[PDB]
Amino acid sequence: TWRRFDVAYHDPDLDRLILAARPLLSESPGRSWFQRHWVRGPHLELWFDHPEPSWERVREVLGTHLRAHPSRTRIDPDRLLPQHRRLALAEQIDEPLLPFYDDNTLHRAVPRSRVHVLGSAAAEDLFHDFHAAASTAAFDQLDAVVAGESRLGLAFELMIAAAHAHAEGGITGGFVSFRSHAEAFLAGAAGLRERWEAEYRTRAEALRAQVAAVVTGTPRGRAWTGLLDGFAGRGDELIASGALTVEDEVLRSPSFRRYRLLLNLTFLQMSRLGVTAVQRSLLCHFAASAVEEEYGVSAIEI
């Protein structure tokens, strides 16, 4: 059985709060993990499958940080609530959306089940295992961000690495998925796409250099794909047995479905690092464009 603690913190910059929580997720046996979530307003979630750290210990560590570094961002519930209602339906969340937590407060919360979305208890357990491993990796990534490294740059690296290692044909195969995701998000937004294209142009040479670096191989890339490798076999088995619901003519291949899962896990990591849905889709646009330009390929030609 899981324990879920919500830390209400309305400033979108959660990095230092997350780093303050690192000991709680690093000091005791058991699976522990964190994610950013929107229910009842922006908050950090800490998940533990073992009894330590206790509430007292959680309160000790986080109370100290909140006193020294309180969030000072006012939110607008009446503006957010329409968006939350859409998210609740799309994400199949049945929890109360109101009232929003007061800023800088700690709460016990309901350990939600995702079996209805993931397909089975086995699939849910796989995701827990992923979040535990990836939360540890996220601490180091967020350290880097706090120290001045680009959040989006770090996320881009993870995505390129995942595609190069885990997509049929490497980066020049996997990039098609990036274009697909970007267009799915845009949903016909010619104006937004134009902004994406314009920003891509300004960043093109740097993004292309980043793609080449990651294809050459970077420490962070190798570490990420190493983490993903640990889940690929289990993913394959659960996809095959129908225990994990993942829902051309290359859709039949377990190879593609594995890729899609591991890319999805990468997106979840990006969320942990504070990259929003719109930013993740922007990065997919950039990734598709950079790959096309660097390797002289076309998503539409395939």
Structure, described:
- The chain has 302 residues and is an alpha+beta fold.
- Strands 2-3-1-4 form a 4-stranded antiparallel β-sheet.
- It has 2 domains: 3-109, no CATH class; 115-295, no CATH class.
- The radius of gyration is 20 Å and the shape is globular.
- It has helices at 15-21, 55-68, 77-91, 115-118, 121-146, 151-166, 171-186, 190-216, 219-241, 254-272, 277-295, and strands at residues 3-8, 32-37, 43-48, 105-109.
- A hairpin with a 5-residue loop joins strand 2 and strand 3.
- Helix 6 packs across helix 9 (219-241).
- The PDB classes it as antibiotic.
- Keywords: Enzyme, thiopeptide, RiPP, biosynthesis.
- The assembly is monomeric.
- [4+2] Aza-Cyclase Y293F variant.
Present the secondary structure layout.
Layout: E1 3-8, H1 15-21, E2 32-37, E3 43-48, H2 55-68, H3 77-91, E4 105-109, H4 115-118, H5 121-146, H6 151-166, H7 171-186, H8 190-216, H9 219-241, H10 254-272, H11 277-295
Helix pairs in contact: 1-5, 5-9, 6-7, 6-8, 6-9, 6-10, 6-11, 7-11, 8-11, 9-10
Short characterization:
62% of the residues lie in helices and 8% in strands. By secondary structure, it is α+β, with helices and mostly antiparallel strands.
Number of continuous helical runs: 11
Q: Tell me, what's the shape?
A: globular
Give the biggest sheet: 4 strands, antiparallel
Q: Going across the major beta sheet, what is the strand order?
A: 2-3-1-4
**Strand elements, count:** 4
Order of helices and strands: EHEEHHEHHHHHHHH
What is the structural class?
alpha+beta
PDB class: antibiotic
Keywords: Enzyme, thiopeptide, RiPP, biosynthesis., antibiotic
Assembly: monomeric
Entry title: [4+2] Aza-Cyclase Y293F variant
